[PDB]
Amino acid sequence: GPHSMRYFETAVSRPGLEEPRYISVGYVDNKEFVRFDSDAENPRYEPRAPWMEQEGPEYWERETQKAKGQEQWFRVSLRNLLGYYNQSGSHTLQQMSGCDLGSDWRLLRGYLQFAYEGRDYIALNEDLKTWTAADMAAQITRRKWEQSGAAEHYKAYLEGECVEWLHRYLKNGNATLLRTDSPKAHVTHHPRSKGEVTLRCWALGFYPADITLTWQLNGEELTQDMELVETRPAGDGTFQKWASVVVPLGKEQNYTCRVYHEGLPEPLTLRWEP
Amino acid sequence: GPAVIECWFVEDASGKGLAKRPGALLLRQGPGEPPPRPDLDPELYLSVHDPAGALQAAFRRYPRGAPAPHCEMSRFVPLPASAKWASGLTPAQNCPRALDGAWLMVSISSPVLSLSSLLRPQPEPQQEPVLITMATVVLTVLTHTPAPRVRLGQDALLDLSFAYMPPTSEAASSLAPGPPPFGLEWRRQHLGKGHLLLAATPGLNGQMPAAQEGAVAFAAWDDDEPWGPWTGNGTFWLPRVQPFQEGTYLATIHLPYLQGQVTLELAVYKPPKVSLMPATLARAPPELLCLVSHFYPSGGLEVEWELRGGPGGRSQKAEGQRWLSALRHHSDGSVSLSGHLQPPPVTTEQHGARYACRIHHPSLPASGRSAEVTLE
Amino acid sequence: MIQRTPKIQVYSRHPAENGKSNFLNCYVSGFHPSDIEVDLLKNGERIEKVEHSDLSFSKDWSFYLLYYTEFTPTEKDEYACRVNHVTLSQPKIVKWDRDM
Amino acid sequence: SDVLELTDDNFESRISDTGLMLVEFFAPWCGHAKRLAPEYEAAATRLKGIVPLAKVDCTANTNTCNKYGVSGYPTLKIFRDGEEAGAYDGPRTADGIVSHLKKQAGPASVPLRTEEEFKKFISDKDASIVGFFDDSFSEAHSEFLKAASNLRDNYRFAHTNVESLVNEYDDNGEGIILFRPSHLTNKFEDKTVAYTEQKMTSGKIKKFIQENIFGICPHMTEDNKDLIQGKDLLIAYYDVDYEKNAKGSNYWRNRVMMVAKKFLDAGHKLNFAVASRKTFSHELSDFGLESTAGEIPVVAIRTAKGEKFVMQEEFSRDGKALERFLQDYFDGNLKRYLKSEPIPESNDGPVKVVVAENFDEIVNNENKDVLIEFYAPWCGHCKNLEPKYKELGEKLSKDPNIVIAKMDATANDVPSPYEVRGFPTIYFSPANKKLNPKKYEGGRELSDFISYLQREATNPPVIQ
Ligand SMILES: *[C@@H]1O[C@H](CO)[C@@H](O[C@@H]2O[C@H](CO)[C@@H](O[C@@H]3O[C@H](CO)[C@@H](O)[C@H](O)[C@@H]3O)[C@H](O)[C@H]2NC(C)=O)[C@H](O)[C@H]1NC(C)=O
């Protein structure tokens, strides 16, 4: 299946003489594996997954030095943005950067993006050459970055190093990142109103989180009324989800719940059972 | 008829940060001298001449007595388009000499209109009679639908029109008849997701990246006049809009070394239908479930509980513990949720006293929607 | 600016059996900005000593946390997650329902 | 060290003191100029003791900049003797600029003072034009130098007084011999060609050179490509490299000439050449030979008018594939190559899909009227018309004389007789008047169409 590496940087200004709080977190797949936090006394990058303990002190030195450089870059950026938008307490500047791979483990997409106040400010497009920028501040930024060939620098970083390091992290952490825990599924019965019964199809214990739960009536897809909740973490590294559908009491067995997941050789099919 | 539009001049302040400074745009009415503005820097007080007449026509219709539009301008240097699909618009490795001189991009935005214009101001302000800086409009791009709201599952028609008056040249006129080929780009950027939706170069039939999501555009010049000015249309048609297609749409008209962009905020909505039933199976009064079904967006829903009095009596905020369910999601991208009320043990008669839930949501009127428990 | 109100789910890590140990979760996600107040509630009162994950980050610029505590579900006891954020006119409460 | 700063005030004056100068006309805002800046300064420093490099900011100095017809930036022009002496179109790099001006620095015609120098001069990969004179005092010698200066950008000139040489290559101490490249010699033509007019003039020399410098089948390269392309011309593309595959490069070139000779001798008129599939991989896209690029040559023809014809058969080693191709061409039995999608399998109605390959078979089937819609996949008008245009096809699904047709004009070349300004553009080609087809320009409504087919349609229309 597909895989990704993403670094999320985040500066949050605080009202008063205080300095902005800068958190930088790296993810493989949806799994955190390194974190830096300005507030922590002795702010350095720490390993957040056990498979990163291999990297020696020279890795954390280089990475920690980059972080403190970014913190300074975010610090000045926050003040400038404060200027243009004319605000007085707390403001948020975010960067995301990384690379999606396909099942071939090859670059499927590269990312370099920013947001101010939870709104896209400027973004490197899919072509890794041009930028999208809505308002005039970001348009002015975009002309500067075009004239400095920022995109060329990032295309080269994302296209080579990003995948390089992602290959290394995938191999080193395979025992958990290339793990495929299969969903344990079961259907529940709940009386509703008059002559009606909610059938809830559960899926528990599944990694990765990518999952499809579908309901049928005589092998026919039920889309209009079907209710899903968002996939959610159990807290033990696995994931949970369910899908529900209303049916008359007595016509339960005409309905079937199929589940789709990586860990399944072929998709499960389920029904309510006394 | 604003006549004069107050505007912020944005400059890269010594690279230490952006800063805004007061200016104004005066749409030439023709007869009569301009109003003196000693409060303004003459370099940022512009007497705007628009041969195409798109800028000026945009504000003649502007509803008199409406709020002033937000206006920003800044200096810019012409660059070629770095996008592959737009490579044919400038197939040489040189820059036109016609673009010599200073350029300003103006961006005017309000609830009725969003506009972007490329101006060429003179290098120094006229000193008599009034200290004002003469400037001429080269390219104008604008939408009359800057914040369209679209019912989930309906088509969205995003207005776009533009005008171009070839910039004056030192010499060697094109002498080439006909409006020149342009480019049109429609893109969406919203909450970290971005897609080129449609690209086109009318006047050059090279292959363009496939249009996405059933999108098309009415991308054309309006006439074939051999000289200009020329006006055109770039209206975007997006069918059966779903929630994932909400957000900021960026439309850019590209001419050689000249880019004009306007943005639109597309909002998707579906109003919530509300019903009230006893949660338990006809259950210490039974727990009440206010079901709020099939609405978008998910934010904005407020669930109010009221105990409506019978004859004589009136509505009062109901008492007892209240909470919400989690969000439930559907196929179309809409959501449902349920509110919950546990009334306290009834300790008094209340003839006609019915419980009701009222919901409010941006899709609804101010009064909202409500339901009383169906006394079947 | 784009502010986003937190989406909430409250659920046990494993299917609740009465008297058996388990973990009560409150998943708060898809909110912006990051300042948020979350608290698990046992019969109205604040379950103190609740532990949370560190602030996490989504590709859409939104944040998410997982608040959790170990707990033994009985029949009479009722649990909830209380959340507050700038997007909300008042704190939002979501009651645990072991079938959801 | 430095680039010279020329202005409207001191251009005419300093343009003379040299005998050439590279002058860069620019504007500070041009990004192409911005990146050229350090490369041009690097060039100036290395060519300091040779040629001067000047720069003219045109925003300031409008007169001098218009004086030499500048339309874009950067424009680089060579000024020898303070007069326009052609532009520089090489790469905007220090290596490119110093390379080019070096050649331009030297004399138009190289004096060969010994036989050894002569032998060296003609051992070049390109041709040599050598003037043989007893001394410098003839009007003929003066004409040779005039021609040499005129055509120095295009050809290599030399002259000698060496007595042994003058007497072996002329019979009155006034001669010009054209020496073709040594590694290109063959049985189909002579190594050398003598100027045979009685009087020697710069004009007649140019004519002599043009008509005889390349022969029947030159090796086309980056240098000579401009001089070779222009008239009806066949190129056979392959791994032509005379420092690696000489035997191989000669073989295919010989086989091309062998076939060319057959047709040329018969009176047929066509120019021929060989060219590297590597050095010219770009030209293949115009023909569709990007994939086909191995040891076996690939062939395509480009007429002076613009038409292109591509050999489909594999180039047999015996030349018989090339013979058939060329036979079909001169008969007028080769269909022209055009950008096209894959023609589809069925193509049943009610509307007939039309790619450029099957265009003239459908749209130009005479005695059969055609309504052709040129559409683009992105156009909204074109989308609005689609269901109306299909309904029109259905109401005409019995009248075979009337065929409703469409073609994606973004994915398919539109033939010269037709022109698509914007979208959609709809043409109607009469039964017999296929040569001069006329536009629709009517209302885009079904009823407007069938009411229009009740008029221009020569045959009566079948409303269904
Ligand atoms: C840019 O192009 C679009 C698409 O052609 C234009 O939208 C179209 O505008 C016309 C009016 O100019 C609409 O015609 C409608 O006709 C009905 C029936 O008579 C009438 O009730 C409406 O009031 C309207 O006049 C048309 O429906 C609409 N959409 C299309 C054609 O799909 C747009 O106006 C153009 N913008 C320009 C020219 O600035």
Residue numbers in the entry:
A (entry chain C): 1 to 88, 91 to 276
B (entry chain A): 1 to 283, 289 to 380, 399
C (entry chain D): 0 to 99
D (entry chain B): 1 to 18, 22 to 467
List sentences quoted exactly from the publication behind this structure.
The presentation of antigenic peptides by major histocompatibility complex class I (MHC I) molecules on the cell surface ensures the detection and elimination of infected or cancerous cells by the adaptive immune system. MHC I complexes are composed of a heavy chain (hc) and the light chain β2-microglobulin (β2m). The chaperone tapasin in conjunction with the oxidoreductase ERp57 is crucial for MHC I assembly and for shaping the epitope repertoire for high immunogenicity.
Here, we present the 2.7-Å crystal structure of an MHC I–tapasin–ERp57 editing complex assembled by a photo-triggered approach. After photo-cleavage of loaded peptides, we first screened different MHC I allomorphs for complex formation with the tapasin–ERp57 heterodimer by size exclusion chromatography (SEC), resulting in murine H2-Db as the most suited MHC I hc candidate. Utilizing microseed matrix screening, we obtained crystals in space group P22121 with an improved resolution of 2.7 Å and only one complex in the asymmetric unit, enabling us to build an atomic model with good stereochemistry. The concave binding site of the N-terminal domain embeds the α2-1 helix region of MHC I hc like a clamp. Upon client binding, the β hairpin of tapasin is shifted downwards to accommodate the α2-1 region of MHC I in a similar way as revealed in TAPBPR–MHC I structures. Furthermore, the C-terminal Ig-like domain of tapasin swings towards the α3 domain of the MHC I hc and β2m, allowing for an additional interaction interface with a buried surface area of 1724 Å2 (hc: 55%; β2m: 45%).
